[model samples]
Target chain A: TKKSAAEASKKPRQKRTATKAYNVTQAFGRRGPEQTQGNFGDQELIRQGTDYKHWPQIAQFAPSASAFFGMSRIGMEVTPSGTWLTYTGAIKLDDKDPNFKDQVILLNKHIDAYKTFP
Target chain B: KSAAEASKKPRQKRTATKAYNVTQAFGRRGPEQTQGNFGDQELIRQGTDYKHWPQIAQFAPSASAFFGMSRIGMEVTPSGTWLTYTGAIKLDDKDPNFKDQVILLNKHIDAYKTFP
Candidate 1:
């Protein structure tokens, strides 16, 4: 029983809490509000292109979201006259997993094991 | 025509003045005092880390002398549990050779040529 407990301790713990997933969309650019006079600061500053969303689809993916936001910020800072000097440190995911359902499905093997135990 | 009459139009002159090529360095960050109350707000938040400045300095190019934070927009849903923050917008003069610069420069040139 002690060995079993030790083995169980070594196994990864299952997440006990559920998280809510939220999508974040962001865009940044140089030339202040006045520099462009509100003209050049339009969708053209977006690196990849206009109409990009941080989370393309909802998933339990945390690291992917962090990387997307972090990279997008850095890309926006990059300009012809100056390089983006690492504005934000890094975007890290607060909630590791957003979608988690609680349910236990019994398999046929479980019934066989129960019969054998008796 | 008399030769003396050719003397007087005051040589309708065109003057060529030397254009000085002055190099100016544009500092990216605005004055610290005008950065608004965001600093105080950040200080009020618990578990906030303040080492972002030094971290940015470590990687910034030599030409860049100043840094500042960017402001991004975000929207919160009706549910109090969820909040979405958008991107950070800031400026820096670190690398003049960034790819974006090339594109902007080309655009600038095109605009200039079209002007006249």
Candidate 2:
């Protein structure tokens, strides 16, 4: 018996996994507690994942506990008239120790790791 | 006469040693390394002395290298929006397994040496 193509098309649809949504915040390059004046006007934003890819959902649901943290900011100053550009702040450290050398080694290690991902 | 001649000679002053000028090279962000997207927005430049003790001499270079590898994104949509964001990507070296083994062996050797 030949079945109608329309009946074959009535099969149940497969459920789709929900797309993850993240809560993000902006960090405008605020100086340290000891800063008196002269702020570095570099703009940035941090995106933190809100979904629980592993374990309990509450274990990683908030901005404070996301598995992923992403950033964007402006490019280095080129001319006085360049537009405000946005980029990622791949590296982060306390302004109190801006000159730490270990930060560089860590940064190199970070880059090396990022390269390995698919 | 010999005493007078020696007394007339002036001692030379000691000069301070010049500091080392160390410069850092940053890795550029591109589509291949960035997975079809730009990685960091800006390339960081950091320079300093190499001999001002390890602490003082290594700060800028370290910072520059750190910023060079950071992950970043714009607040707005690629077409222009109002939310900016940034963060660090979880990445490891190419040979992390081998590297970790080497580090473990080195630590074990150091521990054994302490007992001898």
On TM-score, the leading prediction is 1
Model 2 CA deviation exceeding 4 Å by range:
A1-92, A114-118, B1-116
Relative to the true structure, candidate 2 has a C-alpha RMSD (angstroms) of 25.8
Q: How well is candidate 1 docked (DockQ)?
A: 0.02
| Candidate 1: Cα lDDT at B59 | 29
For model 1 chain A, give the 10-residue run with minimal summed lDDT: A15-24
Candidate 2: TM of chain A?
0.19
For model 2, residues B6-106, the per-residue Cα lDDT tens digits are 22321111111112111011122222321112121111111111122222111111111122222322222333222112222221234345344334223
Error of 1 at A90 (Å): 11
CAPRI category for model 1: incorrect
Provide DockQ values for all models, in the order shown: 0.02, 0.02
Q: TM-scores for all candidates?
A: 0.17, 0.15
Local error of candidate 1 at residue A50 (angstroms): 36
lDDT of 2 by residue, A1-118 (tens): 4323244223211111111221111111222122111121121211221222321221111111000111112232223443212223322232345443443333233222322333
